[PDB]
Design a protein around this ligand. Structure first.
Ligand SMILES: *[PH-](=O)([O-])[O-]
Length: 568
């Protein structure tokens, strides 16, 4: 049938849905949903690490370690199906071959596929579906480094939260791991759960890929790899994710012949994103790992960055208040080294501010200097003391999140880049949630009926990044007023950025325009070391994690050197 946005799935009205800010709650609920499975567990991952703990701090021994959960459910008769991305032979990587063997050795009811063969793009969706009745969709893999809570801690010297290989730091530091010298990289991300017919929609995507891959590879043609069947739409599971509310939901994906055997590619995530931006009335809030857009229909093609610029110019033309918040990582992570990092920085900046085609280029040409009233670009950072020394690290924004108007959300695996959005490249999954239940709220000082689901999630985002967890939240209730935008959002991002720059002289920043200035810069003395008493006094004025994004880091470098589309 013909569905909205050309999705493979219909709008499911009054579906029960949940959101997650960071992995702590997500992994706990996944663990409890799996514990209650009776028939089927389906898992997809870009990377899966079998020994991660889903509940922490650890008690009850290995009861909540991922491999032990799967094994005891398989032992009860639950059939477990796992699809892993097959990384290049030359990748240091994801170790999918080892992980497959580990998993299938736990019990015969556990069946694992890897795809694609290389003798290309990737499978990027991160899904857990239980009994085709509860499904989790997000940006969070069941993998090392992902677990985090809203404190985004840099340290763990008792090994209370990140045992062994789970203590990771994927930030580039070779411009030219041991937990006693080096802080971890915190993992900031977003996920969701859906129930009922919506969950059956997630299952259908997983079944389509499973059966497609089964018939395409010799090794999976045997009876031992079951042919999967969708649960009849006529028919649930004795688990409801606590905290869920009813809303209109719709599954969306990126998929194509190579990834799912469909003849015409699907790019319904992309379509949904452009639609939500175009129809927003008050604000959009983006947290995303990448920010590669602004189409020249030669090297970049997706329409999101141009939709943003054009929505702002409409607000200006109608003399309307409209805000765009953009939170991305301060540096790209690597999980080619430095030339890979630089290529992604090229395209992120190309979308933001480098070129007349940039978002800022387009706004300037029509708005000149008034662009500051409409958009703010940020990353995340934090600090701590490690073994008597002040340290800082960026917080990796791994999210793939769009919120509009406190009433519409898109959560999934798709990054703002062509790889995720065009549909023909990496395979991806997202869900759009549109509120049907509203609460009395405020929007530019005016009475406003906000959506239960989207407002709750936007407020939790705000609390995390602005520093209002467990605090009176009056200052953050209105997401578009001059008072909030200037005195809370833009002020926090500038204040924290200034403090971190002064205390740590950390990269990235607006002073370092070329790689040779970088080397000299980092050899200069650092206050955090020279006068820690004073540094610690200055850091007491930090509130939240938000920091203003530096437009001019490696300004003068041509950040390009492998085809371009690998980076875009
Ligand atoms: P994904 O795990 O690369 O965004």
């Amino acid at each position: 049938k013909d569905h909205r946005f050309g999705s493979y799935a219909a709008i499911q009205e009054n579906a029960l849905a949940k959101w997650y800010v960071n992995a702590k709650g997500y992994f706990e609920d996944v663990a409890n949903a799996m514990e209650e499975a009776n028939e089927e567990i389906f898992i997809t991952d870009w990377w899966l690490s079998p020994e991660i703990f889903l509940k922490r701090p650890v008690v009850e021994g290995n009861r909540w370690r991922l491999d032990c959960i799967l094994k005891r459910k398989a032992q009860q008769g639950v059939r477990i199906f796992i699809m892993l991305y097959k990384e290049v032979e030359l990748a240091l990587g994801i170790n999918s071959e080892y992980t497959k063997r580990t998993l299938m050795r736990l019990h015969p009811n556990i069946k694992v596929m890897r795809h694609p063969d290389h003798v290309l793009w990737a499978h990027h969706e991160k899904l857990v579906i239980i009994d085709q009745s509860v499904a989790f969709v997000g940006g969070i893999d069941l993998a090392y480094g992902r677990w985090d809570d809203n404190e985004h801690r840099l340290t763990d010297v008792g090994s209370v939260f990140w045992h062994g290989k789970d203590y990771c730091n994927f930030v580039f530091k070779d411009w030219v791991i041991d937990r006693y010298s080096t802080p971890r990289m915190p993992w900031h991300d977003i996920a969701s759960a859906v129930h009922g017919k919506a969950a059956r929609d997630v299952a259908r995507h997983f079944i389509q890929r499973w059966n497609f891959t089964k018939i395409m590879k010799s090794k999976y043609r045997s009876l031992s790899y079951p042919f999967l069947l969708p649960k009849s739409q006529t028919t649930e599971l004795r688990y409801q994710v606590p905290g869920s509310v009813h809303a209109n939901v719709q599954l969306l994906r990126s998929a194509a012949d190579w990834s799912a055997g469909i003849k015409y590619h699907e790019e319904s995530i992309h379509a949904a994103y452009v639609h939500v931006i175009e129809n927003s009335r008050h604000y959009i809030y983006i947290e995303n790992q990448f920010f590669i857009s602004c189409a020249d229909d030669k090297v970049v093609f997706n329409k999101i960055g141009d939709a943003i610029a054009q929505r702002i110019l409409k607000a200006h033309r109608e003399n309307q208040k409209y805000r765009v918040y953009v939170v991305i990582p301060l540096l790209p992570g690597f999980e080619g080294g430095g030339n890979a990092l630089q290529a992604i920085m090229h395209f992120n900046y190309r979308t933001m501010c480098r070129g007349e085609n940039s978002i800022l280029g387009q706004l300037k040409a029509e708005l000149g200097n008034q662009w500051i009233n409409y958009i703010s670009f940020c990353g995340l950072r934090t600090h701590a003391e490690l073994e008597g020394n002040l340290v800082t690290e960026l917080i990796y924004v791994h999210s793939k999140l769009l919120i509009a108007d406190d009433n519409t959300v898109i959560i999934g695996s798709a990054n703002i880049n062509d790889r995720s959005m065009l549909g023909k490249r990496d395979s991806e999954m997202a869900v759009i949630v549109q509120d049907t239940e509203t609460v009395p709220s405020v929007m530019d000082g005016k009475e406003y009926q906000a959506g239960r689901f989207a407002r709750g999630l936007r407020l939790q985002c705000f609390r995390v990044v602005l520093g209002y967890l467990d605090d009176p939240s009056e200052d953050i209730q209105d997401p578009v007023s001059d008072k909030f935008f200037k005195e809370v959002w833009v002020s926090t991002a500038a204040r924290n950025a200034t403090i971190y720059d002064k205390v740590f002289r950390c990269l990235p920043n607006d002073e370092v325009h070329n790689l040779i200035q970088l080397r000299d810069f980092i050899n200069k003395p650092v206050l955090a070391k020279e006068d820690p008493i004073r540094a610690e006094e200055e850091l007491k004025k930090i509130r939240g994690f938000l920091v203003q994004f530096p437009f001019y880091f490696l300004s003068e470098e041509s950040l390009l050197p492998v085809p371009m589309e690998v980076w875009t």
